[PDB]
Design a protein around this nucleic acid. Structure first.
Lengths: 80, 104, 107, 91, 204, 74, 70, 170, 28
RNA sequence: CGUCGCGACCCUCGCACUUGGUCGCUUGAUGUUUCUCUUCCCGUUCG
């Protein structure tokens, strides 16, 4: 339904997502899939404890996403 | 005092209602429900997370005289994944936008 | 099969017990095909000894407090909610009304 | 479709539960939280959901360094099947 | 407790604000004041508005034997009497169900079809060789259903006239059929039978 | 070769040890039947926790998801 | 998994149990199973603590948490 | 007017953003210029109808003689009471988690009228007392500070470390 | 009326304010 | 470990639809990982 489509509308923007592990990633959503798999590019990663690190590109499996934070502009999307 | 909702209110009726969404790691997400899914994936606008710190958790034990000081993160427009939801509770109804106050 | 039995229990008082041990006393208003319950005039509770074992029950106590209904400081952490929607995967047990004529519902 | 269900409940492993239901004998269900339930099966399905009668629930709880048994009697109950570890036929 | 008085002063501010009385009642439900207390408050809620029935209909929705007693009062005092037609039909005492409905049609009527089935379908099944020659020789050697049928035929269209006449015959309305017919073969022969059984030999 | 389900259908009427993924429990018993979903029915079962027997159970039905492995016992 | 852009490139996976495996992606699956060539178990900075795994290595997809390019 | 249930139930509720800058998140309940006179046999029982949660309660320009008994509120982090006729500041009556309190242009005349401010919750970060008679008195600011030294702002002027370190020495 | 009463048919058919509390609130 | 801030030096002259750099916190508080308590003035609540 709408929640995955909203993650398609977020492509090209800086998403922030938290995993079940507590790890955080923030970066440009370059791909996303109906399973909520995502690809982030130019990624600020963060271990659950808060130790930051940086990565060029990452793929994240949907099963392990806790939540995804999406740009505020998309509250204007025609989906709603 | 608190909000009452009609007993027939399915999740599809609670769109634009501000929910508290309770999740498998003991945290709550609070925001107006913009959309949902068969999985209970949720879109929460202007979302704010709360958690109970381990320093406050002791205050939940036996002796409204307890006053827990939760820790909060303002998240913004957020998609919750369905696996994480334990339960949802209605916190508030759709309010008038403050624009509507403006007299002229 | 038997979720279509639960769908008949509308407007009847049930004590749902959750996987984490929280007990939800309330009037059952709905059961989705996936066992998502909706209940009204609810009283969440955590059994007495569970409040002493915070390594296992800290998450349960935190989710109970964060419902915002625990304005009562009653022991066993009672929280009162006018409405709750419970995702069906979280249900451990449903303690049914004693007077329920099971045969008429199952047949 | 449903013919396979009537096959599997008759020949397959759940024939134990079916036999216990038909002969009305109590089963000792063992749950993922280490609670036992001793009860009569009134109905079940492929997920091992059950409607149970005369449920007796049994478990240990701990005080300090020793354990005290606890008990409940529940007249009628429904059990979500994902929580079942084992079901044992009472002799 | 104090909290009632906060609504009472509000009633003294503007008593015709219906939402004040509604919120006052709602608080008394939420705390659970007794039935005989809430009755006094609902009767106040009606008495301040005795010119309009809608508040009586909310009262009846809470009083739901006293709801039938007050409904008999509200029928004596017409859309609510139309709403009563299903309850009134189940009383089966036809004068008590029919009089309020015909009064509501007089001050309009929607019961005109359910009561027709109350005649032919509901009342009529219960209200209805050599042996025949023996009976005839012995003779030789020696009406609520009818009223219901007449009421139905009073405003019945031409197509249902035969059905009404047949219902009158099934109600053993010999005199009524004889009177009405004086104003299809089967109807004529039914009038024959009414004359023959009533003993009007010269006309028969 | 022997695929999982043909193999398990071959162990029926032979004694197996079903080790669960939980509680370090292993049930040792005669396999009577199995589901397409790999539920199991054992007879003459013995509960073992960490190799210490909790005695003979009789018949047991074991839900598929609790199982770590089934091993044949010689 | 439109994962093709990683093919024959080196990747580092974080997988269930906080374990990490690095290797060359030689194939993938609907369930996000993956095949690694030249695979290595990683658990520290010290190359003596990291272990060269087998010539071929299949990772069952529900275990993968993230799959990070190198 | 005086407090009645419809007044407290009908009151405009809308989310504001003044505490966040980006998102509208604080429910502001408006009771302004409404000329509610206080009456203990009408007001607190009416305030049992004040919606929950609520975060700013704006009782500006009302005829209250003391701070309303909102002591049962965990949620009202901002209480506005400007231009009211408050005479005494009983810190028991404040909300449990009140952070900002605005007593501008009330009728407070002596430090004895302030003395029970000491009882206010340690969550109180902001106080406004401008336009009270008390603001003209000598050592007024130092008095308010040693009554409640954990203020961060008093009369919209920052409580410096030396002011706090003075106030806590008493 | 639903017609007029007659005995033969009758037998078969039968055999089938603010002021309430305002002043009190002015003194209590 | 991080994070809210606080307060000083370093950026900008103003009518829109993320002010920037840097230092002390010798505590201004706060969240989170890993390792191994007596006593005296006193504020405020409870039955």
């Amino acid at each position: 339904g709408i929640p995955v489509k909203l993650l398609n509308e977020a492509q090209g923007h800086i998403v922030s997502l938290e995993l079940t592990t507590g790890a955080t990633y923030r970066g440009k959503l370059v791909e996303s899939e109906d399973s909520m798999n995502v690809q982030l590019r130019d990624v600020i990663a963060t271990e659950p404890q808060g130790a930051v690190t940086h990565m060029d590109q990452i793929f994240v499996r949907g099963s392990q996403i806790k939540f995804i934070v999406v740009p505020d502009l998309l509250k204007n999307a025609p989906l709603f | 005092s608190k909000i009452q909702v009609a007993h027939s209110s399915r999740l599809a009726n609670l769109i634009d209602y501000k929910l508290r969404v309770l999740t498998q790691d003991g945290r709550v997400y609070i925001g107006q429900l913009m959309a949902f899914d068969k999985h209970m994936n949720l879109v929460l606008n202007e979302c704010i997370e709360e958690r109970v710190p381990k320093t406050q958790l002791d205050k939940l034990r036996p002796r409204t005289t307890l006053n827990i000081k939760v820790e909060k993160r303002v998240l913004g427009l957020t998609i919750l994944r369905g696996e994480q939801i334990l339960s949802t509770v209605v916190e508030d109804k759709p309010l008038l936008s403050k624009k509507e106050r403006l007299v002229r | 099969k038997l979720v279509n039995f639960l769908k008949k229990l509308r407007n009847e008082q049930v004590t749902i017990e959750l996987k984490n041990g929280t007990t939800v006393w309330g009037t059952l208003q709905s059961v989705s095909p996936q066992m998502n319950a909706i209940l009204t005039d609810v009283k969440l509770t955590l059994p007495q000894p569970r409040l002493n074992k915070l390594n296992s029950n800290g998450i349960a106590m935190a989710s109970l407090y964060l419902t915002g209904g625990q304005q009562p400081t009653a022991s066993d952490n009672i929280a009162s909610l006018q409405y709750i929607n419970i995702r069906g995967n979280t249900i451990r047990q449903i303690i049914l009304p004693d007077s329920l004529n099971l045969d008429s519902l199952l047949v | 479709l449903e013919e396979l269900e009537e096959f599997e409940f008759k020949h397959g492993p759940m024939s134990l539960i079916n036999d216990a239901m038909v002969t009305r004998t109590p089963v000792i269900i063992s749950l993922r939280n280490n609670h036992k339930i001793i009860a009569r099966v009134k109905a079940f399905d492929r997920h091992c959901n059950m409607v149970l009668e005369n449920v007796k629930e049994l478990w240990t709880e701990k005080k300090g360094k020793n354990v005290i048994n606890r008990e409940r009697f529940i007249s009628k109950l429904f059990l979500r099947g994902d929580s079942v570890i084992v079901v044992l036929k009472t002799p | 407790n104090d909290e009632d008085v906060a609504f009472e002063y509000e009633i003294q501010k503007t008593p015709q604000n219906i939402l004040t009385w509604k919120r006052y009642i709602e608080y008394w439900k939420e705390e659970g004041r007794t039935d005989k207390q809430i009755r006094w408050l609902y009767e106040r809620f009606c008495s301040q508005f005795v010119t309009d029935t809608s508040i009586w209909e909310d009262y009846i929705r809470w009083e739901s034997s006293r709801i039938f007693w007050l409904f008999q009062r509200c029928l004596k005092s017409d859309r609510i009497c139309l709403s009563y037609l299903e309850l009134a039909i189940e009383q089966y005492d036809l004068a008590m169900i029919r009089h309020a409905l015909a009064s509501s049609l007089m001050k309009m009527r929607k019961v005109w079809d359910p009561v027709i089935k109350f005649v032919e379908e509901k009342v009529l099944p219960l209200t209805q060789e050599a042996e025949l020659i023996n009976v005839l020789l012995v003779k030789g050697f020696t009406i609520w259903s009818s009223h219901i049928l007449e009421r139905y035929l009073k405003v019945a269209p031409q197509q249902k006239r035969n059905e009404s006449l047949a219902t009158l015959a099934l109600t053993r309305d010999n005199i009524t059929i004889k009177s009405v017919y004086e104003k299809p073969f089967e109807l004529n022969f039914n009038y024959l039978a009414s004359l023959e059984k009533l003993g009007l030999d010269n006309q028969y | 070769p022997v695929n999982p389900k043909p193999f398990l259908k071959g162990l029926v009427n032979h004694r197996v040890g079903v080790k669960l993924k939980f509680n370090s429990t292993e049930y040792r018993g005669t396999l009577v039947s199995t589901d397409n979903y790999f539920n199991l029915q054992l007879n003459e079962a013995e509960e073992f926790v960490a190799g210490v027997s909790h005695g003979t159970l009789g018949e047991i039905f074991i839900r598929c998801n609790n199982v770590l492995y089934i091993r044949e016992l010689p | 998994p439109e994962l093709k852009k990683y093919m024959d490139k080196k990747i580092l996976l974080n997988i269930n149990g906080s374990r990490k495996v690095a290797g060359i992606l030689r194939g993938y699956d609907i369930f996000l199973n993956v095949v690694l060539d030249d695979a290595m178990e990683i658990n520290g900075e010290d190359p003596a603590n990291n272990h060269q795994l087998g010539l071929q290595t299949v990772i069952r997809g529900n275990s993968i948490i993230s799959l990070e390019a190198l | 007017m005086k407090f009645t249930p419809s007044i407290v139930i009908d009151a405009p509720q809308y989310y504001v953003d003044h505490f966040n800058g980006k998102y509208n998140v604080d429910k502001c309940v408006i009771l302004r210029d409404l000329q509610l006179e206080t009456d203990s046999e009408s007001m607190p029982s009416s305030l049992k109808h004040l919606t929950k949660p609520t975060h700013i309660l704006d009782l500006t320009n009302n005829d209250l003689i003391m701070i309303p008994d909102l002591s049962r509120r965990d949620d009202i982090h901002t209480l506005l009471l400007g231009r009211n006729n408050i005479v005494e500041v009983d810190g028991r009556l404040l909300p449990m988690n009140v952070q900002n309190l605005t007593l501008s242009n009330n009728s407070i005349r002596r430090f004895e009228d302030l003395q029970r401010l000491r009882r206010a919750p340690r969550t109180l970060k902001n106080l406004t007392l401008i336009g009270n008679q008390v603001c003209h008195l000598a050592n007024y600011r130092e008095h308010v500070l040693r009554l409640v030294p954990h203020l961060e702002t008093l009369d919209f002027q920052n409580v410096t470390a030396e002011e706090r370190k003075s106030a806590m020495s008493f | 009326y639903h017609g007029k009463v007659t005995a033969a048919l009758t037998e078969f058919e039968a055999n089938w304010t603010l002021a309430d509390m305002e002043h009190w609130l002015v003194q209590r």
